[PDB]
Ligand SMILES: C=CC[C@@H]1/C=C(\C)C[C@H](C)C[C@H](OC)[C@H]2O[C@@](O)(C(=O)C(=O)N3CCCC[C@H]3C(=O)O[C@H](/C(C)=C/[C@@H]3CC[C@@H](O)[C@H](OC)C3)[C@H](C)[C@@H](O)CC1=O)[C@H](C)C[C@@H]2OC
């Protein structure tokens with residue numbers, strides 16, 4: 041009934057707004073997430089929030105009231121805003137796909153040539169192209185039809201039924217959801233056919249042989265006992281901690297999916313930031329991003345043993361933390377750490393012979409899920425629109441509207457997928 | 473290189489072993505006598521075990537030449553010292569070390 | 580968590596913005612109770628205190644005039660808590676007057692605090708306490724030793740520069756009762772009479788050699804019983820022998836000369852008794868108990884009252900802990916983090 045439909049619409053729009061606000065805030069000030077891909081993601085998030093705020097309540101009101109009495113020129117504004125939101129959600133995904141394609145072929149070249157300036161430039165360029173393609177065709181009245189009903193609705197201030205001209209419908213479909221769709225699919229297919237080859241470089245095969253040799257139970261996992269099976273490693277003080285950085289999902293053991301991803305952190309191809317972040321993550325005993333007094337005291341107490349008095353160690357730790365607090369919280373962040381350390385030249389001391397870098401293979405799965413879900417949800421609307429525009433004219437006057445709401449739910453889905461990433465979780469927990 | 477110049481000898485019936493842990497009180501210095509650290513600033517002796525590489529090699533190959541309860545002097549060359557890089561904070565690059573270690577207890 | 584062991588008091592984290600430490604005459608008791616807890620002061624307040632001390636010390640004569648009932652104390656070398664115990668032992672500065680002789684800065688982790696407290700009490704008490712220049716108030720020695728790092732870690736280098744420009748004006752002769760002369764080091768053959776130490780320019784960095792470079796660096800003979808013989812211990816000044824001090828005391832009517840270099844287990848030493856009068860002619864005073872935490876020396880402080888010379892012994896007192904060269908534990912432990920992590924990973928991979 042009307043109550044249920046209104047409740048569904050209200051819940052949908054509220055969830056869209058809340059999730060997108062969370063996603064935007066997580067990259068606003070808690071800037072541990074400082075990747076160009078994250079700027080593209082936040083562009084997409086503000087785009088779909090604009091889409092929500094603009095069209096979703098208005099479409100719900102139009103459906104419920106069985107009449108759209110807001111106005112007549114607002115009809116053109118509403119349709120053009122919807123078109124802009126869909127087109128700017130397409131081309132941003134295409135840009136992300138091509139970005140990730142060039143960020144795998146040549147990692148150093150991608151990190152050197154491309155910066156935030158080019159990111160903002162291309163984001164603005166695609167937004168302007170979408171804005172032109174959305175505003176101009178509507179305002180020149182090329183959607184005019186020879187149907188008498190279309191003529192009547194054009195000279196009427198209540199209907200605001202989107203009527204499409206055949207040429208305009210074909211042009212819009214081929215320039216907004218058919219060319220960029222095939223381009224993004226092709227480019228990401230090429231990524232998965234060269235990002236599944238780098239894992240066959242005859243080096244990761246050797247590490248796989250090493251992994252098989254090291255494991256005892258042959259269960260595919262590495263536990264603390266199995267790292268301590270080596271007789272020449274049982275006397276390392278901070279051995280548990282390196283396992284704890286390796287152990288990402290908290291399952292209790294290390295598997296080959298995270299073994300070789302963490303070992304690649306200590307590579308010559310890596311930068312200063314990754315090794316310095318590992319040095320930082322040695323101290324965090326909760327991975328929450330901050331070093332307290334207890335954490336920085338117990339980390340040093342497992343190392344210095346009983347060579348200093350407990351009171352002396354506590355006192356030097358207190359003085360260090362007070363000399364490190366640049367804001368007054370009482371804990372050290374990574375920026376305060378890099379103010380304290382950095383210049384000691386510690387990036388040159390954590391060195392291993394490995395020659396494989398896998399620091400960009402971490403975000404392909406979420407981006408792939410985003411692209412797949414988005415295409416799957418928004419394809420049926422365009423295919424049924426194409427079916428309708430042809431002289432076939434099947435009886436689908438109702439589902440043609442339900443697929444639009446399917447597309448709206450799709451546009452809302454994104455923060456649900458982004459919440460799966462472990463690094464986004466703790467940033468969300470900061471606000472909670 | 474390492475040089476051991478005994479000031480006060482001790483009992484020669486016992487010598488430290490590779491698997492033994494020595495507990496000593498030491499007052500390090502530098503080439504010009506500028507004291508940099510000590511084990512009497514804090515009231516706690518310093519313990520270390522031979523074999524493993526946690527102390528500089530000069531200590532490892534010099535304390536072995538000592539005896540039990542003997543206070544002596546060491547002049548650790550830059551070769552067996554912290555090397556060209558040098559420990560940040562205290563020891564400058566290419567710094568000859570001078571030590572006044574005194575063995576107290578074994579294990 | 581928040582604090583693994585709660586027995587150790589937390590150092591206060593807020594500096595004082597001249598609101599409380601000044602009433603202008605400053606407040607001493609709160610400054611003592613604030614710096615005794617490893618507190619801190621704002622840069623402007625510290626610069627103001629040091630500048631006022633320098634201004635009030637510049638007007639002082641090279642040769643001070645001090646009346647009879649006095650208390651004489653030796654060098655300190657940065658031991659703040661031992662200085663507070665010394666003030667407690669010798670009585671309040673209100674009811675007695677002091678004559679500080681030796682250096683105050685090098686070879687200690689609480690030098691800036693000691694100099695701040697001494698000079699604040701100098702500002703409050705301008706006539707009942709007299710400071711004297713030592714051998715460790717130069718640019719060369721302090722740059723060599725651990726005072727520059729003290730200023731850099733605790734404050735800005737501007738504090739260091741102001742403190743040096745303030746040491747530049749210290750007096751160096753400090754006659755007492757016109758019967759005793761108190762110089763930080765010892766006599767020099769270049770100096771003939773008291774007038775020689777009444778006119779020389781004391782507002783400059785000491786030179787390589789000269790009167791002022793020899794007064795603060797001289798040293799009596801260390802093996803008496805075996806005039807200008809050179810120094811092997813320091814390498815910058817001379818000796819003086821019993822005939823030399825006897826001639827100096829005969830030329831200018833005096834009785835004894837006091838000094839504060841030789842760190843001594845007993846704390847005080849009376850040199851060769853003057854056969855003419857019966858009182859010792861050279862006195863050595865040290866007032867820094869447990870010097871360098873290894874000497875285990877009981878300090879000494881002298882009192883002159885009712886025409887009586889007496890010596891009071893002085894014990895130690897606990898102090899907090901600091902790392903050598905003021906390393907923060909990140910710089911302390913990071914080279915032992917990288918080595919161990921890389922060792923474990925190279926061990927696992929191969
Ligand atoms: C918090 C954990 C860190 C861990 C801290 C402790 C165990 C507390 C312990 C009292 C150390 C002292 O801390 C007050 C302090 O002792 C010195 O003052 C010192 O007199 C010294 O030279 N000693 C100490 C006595 C043995 C010889 C030598 C040493 O070999 O010391 C070793 C040393 C420096 C190894 C280097 C590391 C750098 C590499 O490049 C080099 O490889 C060639 C090998 C000791 C065993 C390290 O475990 C020191 C640490 O870093 C160093 C001047 C600096 C050192 O603090 C850093």
Ligand SMILES: CC(C)NC[C@H](O)COc1cccc2[nH]c3ccccc3c12
Pocket residue numbers: 119122123126127202204208209212213216425444
């Ligand atoms: C009935 C209207 C208000 N609903 C439009 C849909 O939100 C999505 O429609 C589109 C999105 C993006 C580009 C588009 N080009 C078109 C051409 C004809 C009809 C719809 C679209 C269209």
